[PDB]
Each structure stands twice: as structure tokens, then as C-alpha cells.
Design an enzyme around this catalytic site. Structure first.
Site, PDB file in Angstrom:
ATOM      1  N   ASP A 193     -17.936 -75.197  -2.294  1.00 34.47           N
ATOM      2  CA  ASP A 193     -18.406 -75.167  -3.674  1.00 34.47           C
ATOM      3  C   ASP A 193     -18.697 -76.586  -4.175  1.00 34.47           C
ATOM      4  O   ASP A 193     -17.831 -77.257  -4.753  1.00 34.47           O
ATOM      5  CB  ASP A 193     -17.357 -74.479  -4.554  1.00 34.47           C
ATOM      6  N   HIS A 349     -12.857 -83.847  -4.301  1.00 31.13           N
ATOM      7  CA  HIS A 349     -14.131 -83.910  -3.576  1.00 31.13           C
ATOM      8  C   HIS A 349     -14.632 -85.350  -3.550  1.00 31.13           C
ATOM      9  O   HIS A 349     -14.310 -86.132  -4.446  1.00 31.13           O
ATOM     10  CB  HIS A 349     -15.189 -83.047  -4.274  1.00 31.13           C
ATOM     11  N   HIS A 383     -13.240 -79.994   0.876  1.00 27.89           N
ATOM     12  CA  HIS A 383     -12.611 -79.160   1.905  1.00 27.89           C
ATOM     13  C   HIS A 383     -13.171 -79.634   3.245  1.00 27.89           C
ATOM     14  O   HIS A 383     -13.925 -78.916   3.915  1.00 27.89           O
ATOM     15  CB  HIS A 383     -12.948 -77.676   1.702  1.00 27.89           C
ATOM     16  N   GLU A 408     -15.810 -73.812   5.973  1.00 29.20           N
ATOM     17  CA  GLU A 408     -15.799 -72.868   4.861  1.00 29.20           C
ATOM     18  C   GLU A 408     -16.978 -71.916   4.939  1.00 29.20           C
ATOM     19  O   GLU A 408     -18.135 -72.348   4.940  1.00 29.20           O
ATOM     20  CB  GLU A 408     -15.786 -73.564   3.493  1.00 29.20           C
ATOM     21  N   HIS A 410     -17.377 -69.071   2.825  1.00 26.87           N
ATOM     22  CA  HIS A 410     -17.097 -68.247   1.640  1.00 26.87           C
ATOM     23  C   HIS A 410     -18.133 -67.143   1.422  1.00 26.87           C
ATOM     24  O   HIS A 410     -17.788 -66.034   1.008  1.00 26.87           O
ATOM     25  CB  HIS A 410     -17.038 -69.131   0.388  1.00 26.87           C
ATOM     26  N   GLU A 453     -11.406 -70.863   2.379  1.00 29.31           N
ATOM     27  CA  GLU A 453     -12.214 -69.707   1.997  1.00 29.31           C
ATOM     28  C   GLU A 453     -13.120 -69.204   3.125  1.00 29.31           C
ATOM     29  O   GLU A 453     -14.355 -69.206   3.020  1.00 29.31           O
ATOM     30  CB  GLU A 453     -12.990 -70.004   0.698  1.00 29.31           C
ATOM     31  N   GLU A 529      -4.689 -74.605  -4.659  1.00 30.16           N
ATOM     32  CA  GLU A 529      -5.502 -74.778  -5.877  1.00 30.16           C
ATOM     33  C   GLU A 529      -4.831 -74.030  -7.025  1.00 30.16           C
ATOM     34  O   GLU A 529      -4.365 -72.899  -6.842  1.00 30.16           O
ATOM     35  CB  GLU A 529      -6.935 -74.244  -5.680  1.00 30.16           C
ATOM     36  N   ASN A 589     -28.499 -70.949  -8.705  1.00 26.64           N
ATOM     37  CA  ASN A 589     -27.508 -71.993  -8.897  1.00 26.64           C
ATOM     38  C   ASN A 589     -26.306 -71.410  -9.621  1.00 26.64           C
ATOM     39  O   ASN A 589     -26.369 -70.283 -10.118  1.00 26.64           O
ATOM     40  CB  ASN A 589     -28.108 -73.155  -9.692  1.00 26.64           C
ATOM     41  N   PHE A 593     -20.370 -74.629 -13.142  1.00 27.34           N
ATOM     42  CA  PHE A 593     -19.204 -74.467 -12.264  1.00 27.34           C
ATOM     43  C   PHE A 593     -18.946 -75.638 -11.310  1.00 27.34           C
ATOM     44  O   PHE A 593     -17.904 -75.687 -10.680  1.00 27.34           O
ATOM     45  CB  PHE A 593     -19.231 -73.134 -11.500  1.00 27.34           C
ATOM     46  N   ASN A 596     -15.337 -79.214 -12.765  1.00 29.08           N
ATOM     47  CA  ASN A 596     -13.984 -78.671 -12.917  1.00 29.08           C
ATOM     48  C   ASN A 596     -12.937 -79.763 -12.981  1.00 29.08           C
ATOM     49  O   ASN A 596     -11.748 -79.493 -12.784  1.00 29.08           O
ATOM     50  CB  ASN A 596     -13.598 -77.756 -11.744  1.00 29.08           C
TER      51      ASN A 596
HETATM   52  C1  LIG Z   1     -15.618 -67.946  -9.022  1.00 29.71           C
HETATM   53  C2  LIG Z   1     -14.687 -67.346  -7.966  1.00 29.71           C
HETATM   54  C3  LIG Z   1     -15.192 -65.967  -7.547  1.00 29.71           C
HETATM   55  S1  LIG Z   1     -14.537 -68.399  -6.538  1.00 29.71           S
HETATM   56  C4  LIG Z   1     -13.705 -69.872  -7.040  1.00 29.71           C
HETATM   57  O1  LIG Z   1     -14.702 -70.715  -7.614  1.00 29.71           O
HETATM   58  C5  LIG Z   1     -14.155 -71.902  -8.172  1.00 29.71           C
HETATM   59  C6  LIG Z   1     -15.247 -72.482  -9.062  1.00 29.71           C
HETATM   60  O2  LIG Z   1     -14.995 -73.851  -9.384  1.00 29.71           O
HETATM   61  C7  LIG Z   1     -13.626 -72.782  -7.025  1.00 29.71           C
HETATM   62  O3  LIG Z   1     -14.675 -73.164  -6.121  1.00 29.71           O
HETATM   63  C8  LIG Z   1     -12.565 -72.000  -6.239  1.00 29.71           C
HETATM   64  O4  LIG Z   1     -12.192 -72.712  -5.044  1.00 29.71           O
HETATM   65  C9  LIG Z   1     -13.033 -70.591  -5.864  1.00 29.71           C
HETATM   66  O5  LIG Z   1     -11.901 -69.834  -5.416  1.00 29.71           O
HETATM   67 MG   LIG Z   2     -15.659 -71.668  -1.910  1.00 33.37          MG
HETATM   68 NA    NA Z   3     -16.524 -75.578  -8.760  1.00 33.35          NA
END
Ligand SMILES: CC(C)S[C@@H]1O[C@H](CO)[C@H](O)[C@H](O)[C@H]1O
Ligand SMILES: [Mg+2]
Ligand code: NA
Ligand SMILES: [Mg+2]
Ligand code: NA
Ligand code: NA
Ligand code: NA
Ligand code: NA
Lengths: 1015, 210
Positions: A193, A349, A383, A408, A410, A453, A529, A589, A593, A596
Site C-alpha cells: 500500500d 515506509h 514492507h 506482499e 494483497h 498481507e 499494525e 486510485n 489513503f 496515514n
Molecule cells: C482498507 C483495508 C481493507 S486494508 C488496510 O489498508 C490500510 C490503509 O492505509 C493499510 O494499508 C493496512 O495495512 C491495510 O490492512
Molecule cells: Mg496491503
Molecule cells: Na495507506
């Protein structure tokens, strides 16, 4: 061959002609240089100006490029991400792959970066020995040529790829050509992410090694039961011709003092029926009373590994920092040097707002200093393996590291689709094994992680066991598949809540307190986390810390995360602004998000950072009468750089203060007897504030650094004495449309149609731009929004519940507006109902009492329908005509604080510039609230009571309608929101409602009271 | 000094409004020069015969949290029945009210007293929006007990058989009541969330005849 084999669409091919991985090498040819970690003549940097051309696909790259510079190329800085140079768009996506999921294939339109460099090689480098090139990071796959001839290929964006150029080079000028592919089969294992970028984004260097050479070395430290004795064991491997006259010496240094040394010829002990390793040797050094490494005291020794001849001629030397520490799990507790850790961690990160994913020493240092200054002791490499310098700095400054494999997946369905598939075992193994081979000598690394993930597959079990076998000195953890699988030594959930279960099928997130005691469970629990710090967040952070302190097997966690992944763009005026997902034309996109962090991209703190610092304090405090008990949470160090400052104040007015040196043993207690405090002059509440101050500067902090604080209420003397009754009496002027009240120069105007105070005059100057009206909504925080969007509503999100109930469009219907004349005051009584499509949401009943002193006392009683979603706030708002420079308040501060995030805030008299009362979240929302406020001052106005408030040049309307902070414009006057009550902000995660029940406004009936006057 | 604290009058004023009389009062409760509690009230009596009592109390943060915040009086009336809309039918306290149900309950007066062998505060019902007794009705959001025994008598009498019905009926109407606890009975056991520690308290009652 290169275009025909398509090695970038084959997970069976992760490299061609790549050399074995190993710990950091410099090939010193002088032992003293190795000891002091001075630059090596044999390790050259190729960073700087390179040539670069962009192509839409590898098929579009002209063959002439292999031998001759392209005239259309540009001269660019390397290391770099080519998105940061404007060659194509960076893409922000969270879970969904930026490419069609069709393993192992990637798009035919595959952006291709053609890098080249003309550079000189000294003739001495080619007359003997081996010259290799090292690419610390190339994203995501690349082919390499040297002087027109093909050398090799490499994948894994986050580990160094090394190639022997001995046969390819000539004395003087040489030309490298590097074809970097944005997408490869490696991309399927790199679904973190974060911004999706590409290029040669870490260091490029050239290393000269002798033909007969140290090819690997491993350093282990084991201890007796009380850590008073240690054995350092160093396994050293060679390549080249074995000779009986060859020797290895390992010497260990504490500063300038050699403390141990051992020399041996090559030839290891018998391993099996075929013998032993003739090309290896292991040295064992005894160390009495070693100085132990921890994050508290990062004692380091230097190990120097010399390859030499019997007669004493040095061939080469390698070296590393050694930290004497033991990491083990025993009886369900993670121990360091025999003591149970409390992980005050954060995920970090590698991100820079200007340079993208290129890391630099200065930024790394700034991060570590800010982390340690805010009471963090641990970092997770989310990660992927980091820039090599990161580990050196963590060794030296003292932070615990979770080193994590670059795996990863995911976006797969289901998440373990690749990780359970034996076809992908080879690619996965290299991401794990080559990380361990690079990083195993760093003391800062205490835990290995299998990635992030990617569900739980059989490949995880294989690789878990591989690490356990090769490196017994460090636990292995992995969260995928439910956080407590057979592939993890540590229960390591992400966003599991303190008390609340989230029983998702197959992969439940139990309450962390409950998780520990599940039948048969014995492992420690450390959240990989937690406390998703997206925008206005960290609500409930104190709940985690209370639980971490209470439960031995809850040993902490890593906050998500350190730094916002915003990027710099420029507007028409050339002004830089902060950009997030979608701002580069990237689509699909995941918008904001990517942000953070506890800090903004430029490392300016969010208000949440102070909450983390306070909750992560290493000193705990209790008050009993005159006695302050100070408890140390340090495991190893005495408090040898700490004094306690104490202060007693009466509603912000200092009464007494003092200093006492702190002399506390690790995990010990000190009792501090406060002197007899003089009796307060007048009525009010006495408050005690204590602070721990570090008088001396350290490697990570300035002289006078505050590391901990706490407040208590002492004696309160309730005011019983009535103020002298004023001679003036207010007059009520009644008209059809208005109730007006006059008192000398002052006038109050209550509109009889609306039922609100619509204007106030001090002289002939108007005080209001908008009437004073009830407010039950806020500009939605990221936590209120979650994953909801206009195109796909999440009806469970707080913002959507408020929207659907009509909270944002409810209209005030006047039920009552009356006026009365009292003996010494004018009394205005109002009642309003807020309704949406026939439904009464809220009823507000008010009295306004204006007396001879010019004070307006406002009493508010609100009813909230039990079946409407609990409102974001219960308060009043208005737009003041005044714009004043300062804001002065008696209450919690100085920083932004909310009901579930106010523990760090202190009660005192605070005075700030108006701009400091606004928090510039990149995605705008309700911000800048201060709670527990008894007095607020702004220009000619004073409000008294017990309320929360924010004050700024931005309406709630503008904040909720504006997607980016740089687009905000200061409105006329000043918007004031005064809340009797305000809902929590949450943040346990930012994709489901996370505000705890006790911070929701569910009481149904609410009472508050204010006095508006002139100070 | 909670038990011995005497009310000191700070203010007592009467005003005439358009359709009501407004009585404003303020009291301080002190012990040896220390102000424990301040109570500020308005009584608003309108043309419909209803008396709205608004109560705002301050509690000194350094006094031990009080057992209740409410009003009491001895009524002349002795009636057979007690009728209320609130939690019941049985005795319930803020930390022991989950079994109680919100509904219309109607019991003989004797059922509103719990005959604990060692007498104490007893018979409270919480979450009550309406209480009816003889000619009287009280409305709001309160907790109440109602019986022939004063708090003073209950605390002075060590056995239930030595209790005597007093003239008329003792009414205790609380805006707020402290938890009873019980995790054990040899150290304080009332959980923090059931202690009256908020410092400022507000409640409203309407007293009328129906
Ligand atoms: C939005 C969830 C379904 S996933 C969730 O997203 C976050 C967003 O910052 C982080 O990336 C976390 O690691 C992830 O578990
Ligand atoms: Mg992820
Ligand atoms: Na994020
Ligand atoms: Mg491949
Ligand atoms: Na713990
Ligand atoms: Na000290
Ligand atoms: Na917004
Ligand atoms: Na008794």
C-alpha cells in the site's frame, strides 16, 4: 535473446548471473581503516549524473542504445524514481494491483527506463582482483550491459543485485546500459500500500575485491545466564584458491581498545560423512562482562575480519558493528537480554515528498531523532528490506528493528493464491533468504518477518522453517492468514481492538486481551499494525497503552504509520502543494489513503504525535497526598539524565514550582515528597503538573528535552461569594421581527422569525457575520468517511449514517421565542426542532439571560432522538466579524485535542497565534478542537463555561467541500464552534466505525451552559 | 462532613414573568470552612399549575464523590399505591439495573421498601420518567425511592424490626445516584464509571397535581 526470453514474465527467472548475497562489504586493504569504518578506496559510488530515456515498452528500445548514447536522452540524477522527474505518472493504489491480475504476465505497454553511464575505471582495478557493480535498488526488474555486452538480469526491487564486471571492463572510459522495466512477474509480490514507482532508486556502486577473498561472514553472540560472560562466534567463508598459508583473524574492539582476537587457518570442523568445509573457518572469542546492546543503551563493539598470510601480509579486511544482545521468547514473553520488552513501535515506509522512494542519510537521521524524541523504541520495515544505511543508524542510535521480506500479494483472490502455490516458492524464497544473508549481522534487527498481507500459504511455512534453521537468534513473525498461524512466533495482528472482538470468518480479529488466553495459546502478542493515524486520528490510543501495561504478554505494537505518503506538485504560481492518490491522473486510485502518518511528508508533526509520546512515556507516576511515586519502565538504564520539574497553579496562575533529581533504577521506584504548599489566595482549582527533563544533550536529543509529563487536580475551592451587583439594567425593545436588548454601548438582536441571536453591537460595530445557531454536524474526518465514496457508498460509515438521517440538511423549525424582563436582566427563551422528511432529529431549548454587567448567560438543553445516529457534536457556531492575532484559553492544550485523544494535553493558560488553532490536514476536515476549556478569549470576546471549541478562518461547510488543504481560502471574519459535547474521532482503523461506545453522543438529553461577555 | 454539612443560603429571589413566577435559589454546603457542594435552582410555576424545578449542582473535586445528587421531602400523604413509568418492578440501582424493564409499574407502597435485615438505603428505581403518588405527579429523568422511613432513621437503626413508620411518606428523588458495588464487602467496590465524579450535575423535574 533478451526480448525473446521475456524474463520479466517468468517467476522461474528472478535473476541471471547475479552474485550471491552477503553482509555489507568494503574490501578495506588496511585494517585500521576497517576498524574505524572510514571510506574504502575499493568501494566507489556511481551516484550522480546519468543519462536517461523513457520508452513505452522494451520493444521500443533501439539497439543503438547498447553501444552509443541516445541523443534524445536527458541528464538526470541517480538514484531517482523516474516518476519524480515527470517521465510518467506515479500510481497510488492500496489493495488492487495497478496491473491486470493475470500472473505471470504484465501489460504489453510496460514503461521502460533506459539508464546509461560513462565512467572511468583505474587500471589497477583490472590488473588484479574482481570488480563488481552493486545496484542497491532497481524497481522492478532490469537487464544490464557493459560496453555493449550483456551482463545479467535481476528482480526484487528492495535488495541489492550484484554482477561481476571483471571481464567486461577496460582501463579508462566504460559505458553501462541499464534497461529497467516498471512491471515484471516480481510486481505480483510487490503489492504494498504505497505509490507505485520505478527506476534506479537506491545507490549504485563498484566494489573491488581480491581474487582470494572473504565471500561471507556471520557473527553470533551467546551468553551465560546473567550476561556477565559472552562468546562471540564468527563464521568466515572464502572464495579463491585455498592455500595452507592463508589465515583469518577476527579481532573485537571496544572503542580504541582491542578486547579479544583469534587467528586460524581455513578448514571447518567435520560436518558429515564427506568431511567439512575446507573454504570456511569459525573463530570463537571470549568476552568478560560485555557491554550489552539495547535501544536504551546502544553499546557497540567493532568486529574486524582480516584475510591474511601466515607471515602477516594483509589480503583484505571486512568489518561490522557488533551489539551484544540476546533475543528469545520464553514462557510466552519476548525477552531482550533476559528482560521483557515493551515495544513502542511504528511502521515506516521509505518516503520523501520530493524524491519519492529515494532515501538519504539526512532524512533517515531526522526520522530516527523524531522517533526517539517521541518515545518510540522500535521500527517495522513496512514492507520490504530498507536502504542499507537504515540498519547502521538503528544499530548506532538504538532502535529495535523488524526486518521484513519484500513479499506482499494483497490483491490476489484469495490472498494466499500465489503463496500457497509451489510455482512461486522459488521467487518467494529469494526475497526471504537474500534478506537474511544481507542483514543477519545487524544487532538492531531483532525479529524477521515473512512479508505482509499475502494470506497464509505452504510457502510461508517452508520459509518460516528455513529462517528458524539458519538463524536461531531471532524470532520469526508473519501476520497473514489470521495473525496466529504456524508461520509466526508472535501473535501479530493488525488493527485488532483492545476490548472489542471482530469475529470475521476464517480470519477473526479478537480483542487482544482475549486473544492471549484462547485455549492452548501461549505466545506473546505484539500488533504489527495498530492505531491507524489517517488524518484526524489516534482516538483511543490510550486504551492500547493501558492494556499493554496491565498484561505481561501484550508487549506493544507498531503504529500505522510514521510519515504521510503525500507528494509535491506545483500550481500556476509555482507554489508547491501536497498531492495524494488520483492527483497524477492515476486511476483507479485510493485517494487520501496514502496519508496515514504521525508526521506530514516534510516531517512536521500531526497533533497525534504528542499523544503517542505521552502514552509511550518511560516513567509512570502516582500521587498520594504530598507524595509523588515515580516508576521507571526502563529495563537496563538508571535515570542518569533526568530531573523532575513540578509546578502547582491556580487556574493557570503559578503558585509554586521546584526541581528534584531523578535517581531511579530500571523498573525501580522513587518517592518524592512535595513541600507544604501555601494556601491559595482565591477560589478555583489547583493543578499539579510534573515533567521529566533531560538536562544533558544526547546523540538523539537536545539539552532540556522533555521526555514525560503528568497532571493531577489538587484542592479545589468552590466560589461562594457573589460578585457586587451592577447598577445598570438592560432594556428590552420589542418589535414584530425582533427582540432587542440595549445596555449603554452594547446591543443584542434576537430575530423573532428564526429564533436566533442574529447580531451584536459594541458601539456601532457589528460583531457577527452569521447568526449564532446550534450545530450537530462536523466536516467529516477520514475515520468518519472510511472507504465510502460517491460511486460506492458504504452505508455503515459514520458520514453516510449522518447523511442518510438528514443531519447535514436538517432545517431549524422555530417552536418558541419569548422575552421577559427580570429585576436585573432580560430573559430570552427559545425552542427549535430539527427535522428531516417528517422526522424530528433534535430539539434545542435555550435561555439567554443578559444582566447589567453585559454578560449573556446561555443555557442549552438538547434532546436527540434515540433512533437517529448519534450526532458528531452538540454545540453552537457563528461567524464573528473580528479577525484577531491571538487565541487565549484556560483549558487543555496547547495542541489540538479530542475526547478520545486528550491525554497528552495539559490544563493550563494557553496563548497561541490564530493560525496554530488550525491543523492543516492535507485532506481537510473538522480540526483544531481543544477540550476541557473553562475560559476562551478572542479579540473583545470572552466565553466562560465548560466546553470544547475550535476557531479558524474556515467554515465547517468549506472544510467538508474542499478535498485539498491548498485550495482552502480564509473566509471573512472568524468561524467559532463552541461545543458542549463532541464525539470521539476513533482510528483503531479507518475503514469501519471505530469510535468507542463511551465516546459516542448517545445520552439522549444534553445540558451545557456558557457565558458570553467582554473580558 | 457530608452527613453534618448545613445548607448556607447564597441567593433567594422571586420574579414575575408573562405567564409564570420564577423563584431562583443558590445554596452552599460547608464543613469547617470547606465548601462541599453548591446547588443552584430555578422553580418555574406556570398557568397550568406545573412547577418546573431546574437543578445545577457543583461538587468540589477534592471531596469524596457523593452517594447521590437529589432532593428529598416528607409528604403529608400516605397513599396505598405507587405508579411509575420507569425501570422495574423491583428495586434497581445504576450498577444493578439490567434485569429491570422500562414499563408502567404499579405496586403497593410496602413493595417500594426492601426489608434488608440490616437497614440501609433501599428501594430505588432508576430511569424513571414519571412518578405518581396520591395527588402528586413528578416528571423528568430520575431515580427515586419512596417509603415511610427517613434516610436518617434507616441509618440509625441496626435491625429492620426496630423500624417504625413515620408520619406521611419520605420521597427521595435523585438526578444521580452512586453505584452499590459488591465485588466484595470489605473494601470500596463501586466501579469508577458508577461514582459521581463529574463535578457538575444537571437535572430537571416537573411537579404537578393530576
Ligand atoms: C482498507 C483495508 C481493507 S486494508 C488496510 O489498508 C490500510 C490503509 O492505509 C493499510 O494499508 C493496512 O495495512 C491495510 O490492512
Ligand atoms: Mg496491503
Ligand atoms: Na495507506
Ligand atoms: Mg522473471
Ligand atoms: Na505488557
Ligand atoms: Na538524573
Ligand atoms: Na474535506
Ligand atoms: Na442501619
Amino acid at each position: 535473446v533478451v526480448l525473446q526470453r521475456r524474463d520479466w514474465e517468468n517467476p522461474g527467472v528472478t535473476q541471471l548471473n547475479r552474485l550471491a548475497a552477503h553482509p555489507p562489504f568494503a574490501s578495506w586493504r588496511n585494517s585500521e581503516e576497517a576498524r574505524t569504518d572510514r571510506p574504502s578506496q575499493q568501494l566507489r559510488s556511481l551516484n550522480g549524473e546519468w543519462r536517461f530515456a523513457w520508452f513505452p515498452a522494451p520493444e521500443a528500445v533501439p539497439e543503438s542504445w547498447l553501444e552509443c548514447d541516445l541523443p534524445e536522452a536527458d541528464t538526470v540524477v541517480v538514484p531517482s524514481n523516474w516518476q519524480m522527474h515527470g517521465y510518467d505518472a506515479p500510481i497510488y493504489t492500496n489493495v488492487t494491483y495497478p496491473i491486470t491480475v493475470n500472473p505471470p504476465f504484465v501489460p504489453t505497454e510496460n514503461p521502460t527506463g533506459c539508464y546509461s553511464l560513462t565512467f572511468n575505471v583505474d587500471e589497477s582495478w583490472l590488473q588484479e582482483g574482481q570488480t563488481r557493480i552493486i545496484f542497491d535498488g532497481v524497481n522492478s526488474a532490469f537487464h544490464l550491459w557493459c560496453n555493449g555486452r550483456w551482463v545479467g538480469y535481476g528482480q526484487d526491487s528492495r535488495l541489492p543485485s550484484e554482477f561481476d564486471l571483471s571481464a567486461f571492463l577496460r582501463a579508462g572510459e566504460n559505458r553501462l546500459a541499464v534497461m529497467v522495466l516498471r512491471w515484471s512477474d516480481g510486481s505480483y509480490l510487490e503489492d504494498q500500500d504505497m505509490w507505485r514507482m520505478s527506476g534506479i532508486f537506491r545507490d549504485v556502486s563498484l566494489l573491488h575485491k581480491p581474487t582470494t577473498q572473504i565471500s561471507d561472514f556471520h557473527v553470533a553472540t551467546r551468553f551465560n545466564d546473567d550476561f556477565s560472560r559472552a562468546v562471540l562466534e564468527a563464521e568466515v567463508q572464502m572464495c579463491g584458491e585455498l592455500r595452507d598459508y592463508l589465515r583469518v583473524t577476527v579481532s573485537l574492539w571496544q572503542g580504541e581498545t582491542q578486547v579479544a582476537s583469534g587467528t586460524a587457518p581455513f578448514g571447518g570442523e567435520i560436518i558429515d560423512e564427506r568431511g567439512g568445509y575446507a573454504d570456511r573457518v569459525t573463530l570463537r572469542l571470549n568476552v568478560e562482562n560485555p557491554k550489552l546492546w539495547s535501544a536504551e543503551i546502544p553499546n557497540l563493539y567493532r568486529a574486524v575480519v582480516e584475510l591474511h598470510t601466515a607471515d602477516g601480509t594483509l589480503i583484505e579486511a571486512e568489518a561490522c558493528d557488533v551489539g551484544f544482545r540476546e533475543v528469545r521468547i520464553e514462557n510466552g514473553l519476548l525477552l531482550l537480554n533476559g528482560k521483557p520488552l515493551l515495544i513502542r513501535g511504528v511502521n515506516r515506509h521509505e518516503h520523501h515528498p520530493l524524491h519519492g522512494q529515494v532515501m538519504d542519510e539526512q532524512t533517515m537521521v531526522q526520522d530516527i531523532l523524531l522517533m526517539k524524541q517521541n518515545n518510540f523504541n522500535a521500527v517495522r520495515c513496512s514492507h520490504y528490506p530498507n536502504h542499507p544505511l537504515w540498519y547502521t543508524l538503528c544499530d548506532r542510535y538504538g532502535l529495535y528493528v523488524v526486518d521484513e521480506a519484500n513479499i506482499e500479494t494483497h490483491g490476489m483472490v484469495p490472498m494466499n493464491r500465489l503463496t500457497d502455490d509451489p510455482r512461486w516458492l522459488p521467487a518467494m524464497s529469494e526475497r526471504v533468504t537474500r534478506m537474511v544473508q544481507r542483514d543477519r549481522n545487524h544487532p538492531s534487527v531483532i525479529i524477521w518477518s515473512l512479508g505482509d498481507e499475502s494470506g497464509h500459504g505452504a510457502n510461508h511455512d517452508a520459509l518460516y522453517r528455513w529462517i528458524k534453521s539458519v538463524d536461531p537468534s531471532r524470532p520469526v513473525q508473519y501476520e497473514g492468514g489470521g495473525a496466529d498461524t504456524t508461520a509466526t512466533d508472535i501473535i501479530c495482528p493488525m488493527y485488532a481492538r483492545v476490548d472489542e472482538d471482530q469475529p470475521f470468518p476464517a480470519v477473526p480479529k479478537w480483542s487482544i486481551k482475549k486473544w492471549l488466553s484462547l485455549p492452548g495459546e501461549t505466545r506473546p502478542l505484539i500488533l504489527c499494525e495498530y492505531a491507524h493515524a489517517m488524518g484526524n486520528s489516534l482516538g483511543g490510543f490510550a486504551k492500547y497503552w493501558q492494556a499493554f501495561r496491565q498484561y505481561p504478554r501484550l508487549q506493544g505494537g507498531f503504529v500505522w504509520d510514521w510519515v504521510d505518503q503525500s507528494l509535491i506538485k506545483y500550481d500556476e504560481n509555482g507554489n508547491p502543494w501536497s498531492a495524494y492518490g488520483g492527483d497524477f491522473g492515476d486511476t483507479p486510485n485510493d485517494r487520501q489513503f496514502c496519508m496515514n502518518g504521525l508526521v506530514f511528508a516534510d516531517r512536521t508533526p500531526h497533533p497525534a504525535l504528542t499523544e503517542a509520546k505521552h502514552q509511550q512515556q518511560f516513567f509512570q507516576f502516582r500521587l498520594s497526598g504530598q507524595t509523588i511515586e515515580v516508576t521507571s519502565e526502563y529495563l537496563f538504564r538508571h535515570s542518569d539524565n533526568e530531573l523532575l520539574h513540578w509546578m502547582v497553579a491556580l487556574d493557570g496562575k503559578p503558585l509554586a514550582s521546584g526541581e528534584v533529581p531523578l535517581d531511579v533504577a530500571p523498573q525501580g521506584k522513587q518517592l518524592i515528597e512535595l513541600p507544604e504548599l501555601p494556601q491559595p489566595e482565591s477560589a478555583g482549582q489547583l493543578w499539579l503538573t510534573v515533567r521529566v527533563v533531560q538536562p544533558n544533550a544526547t546523540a538523539w536529543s537536545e539539552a532540556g528535552h522533555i521526555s514525560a509529563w503528568q497532571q493531577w487536580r489538587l484542592a479545589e475551592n468552590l466560589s461562594v461569594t457573589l460578585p457586587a451587583a451592577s447598577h445598570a439594567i438592560p432594556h428590552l425593545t420589542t418589535s414584530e421581527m425582533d427582540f432587542c436588548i440595549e445596555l449603554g454601548n452594547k446591543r443584542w438582536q434576537f430575530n423573532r422569525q428564526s429564533g436566533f441571536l442574529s447580531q451584536m453591537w459594541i458601539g456601532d460595530k457589528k460583531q457577527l457575520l452569521t447568526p449564532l445557531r446550534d450545530q450537530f454536524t462536523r466536516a467529516p474526518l477520514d475515520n468518519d468517511i472510511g472507504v465510502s465514496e460517491a460511486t460506492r457508498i458504504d452505508p455503515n460509515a459514520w458520514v453516510e449514517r449522518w447523511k442518510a438521517a438528514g443531519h447535514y440538511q436538517a432545517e431549524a423549525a422555530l417552536l418558541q421565542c419569548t422575552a421577559d424582563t427580570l429585576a436585573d436582566a432580560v430573559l430570552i427563551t427559545t425552542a427549535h426542532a430539527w427535522q428531516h422528511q417528517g422526522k424530528t432529529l433534535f430539539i434545542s431549548r435555550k435561555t439567554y439571560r443578559i444582566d447589567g454587567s453585559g454578560q449573556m448567560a446561555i443555557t442549552v438543553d438538547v434532546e436527540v432522538a434515540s433512533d437517529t445516529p448519534h450526532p458528531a457534536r452538540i454545540g453552537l457556531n457563528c461567524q464573528l466579524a473580528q479577525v484577531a492575532e491571538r487565541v487565549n484559553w484556560l483549558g487543555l492544550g496547547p495542541q489540538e485535542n479530542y475526547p478520545d485523544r486528550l491525554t497528552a494535553a495539559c490544563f493550563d493558560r494557553w496563548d497561541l497565534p490564530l493560525s496554530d488553532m488550525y491543523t492543516p490536514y492535507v485532506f481537510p476536515s473538522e480540526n483544531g478542537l481543544r477540550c476541557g476549556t473553562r475560559e476562551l478569549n478572542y479579540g473583545p470576546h470572552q466565553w466562560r463555561g465548560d466546553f470544547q471549541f475550535n476557531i479558524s478562518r474556515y467554515s465547517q461547510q468549506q472544510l467538508m467541500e474542499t478535498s485539498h488543504r491548498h485550495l482552502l481560502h480564509a473566509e471573512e471574519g472568524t468561524w467559532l464552534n463552541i461545543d458542549g459535547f463532541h464525539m470521539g474521532i476513533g482510528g483503531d482503523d479507518s475503514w469501519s466505525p471505530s469510535v468507542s461506545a463511551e465516546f459516542q453522543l448517545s445520552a439522549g438529553r444534553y445540558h451545557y451552559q456558557l457565558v458570553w461577555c467582554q473580558k
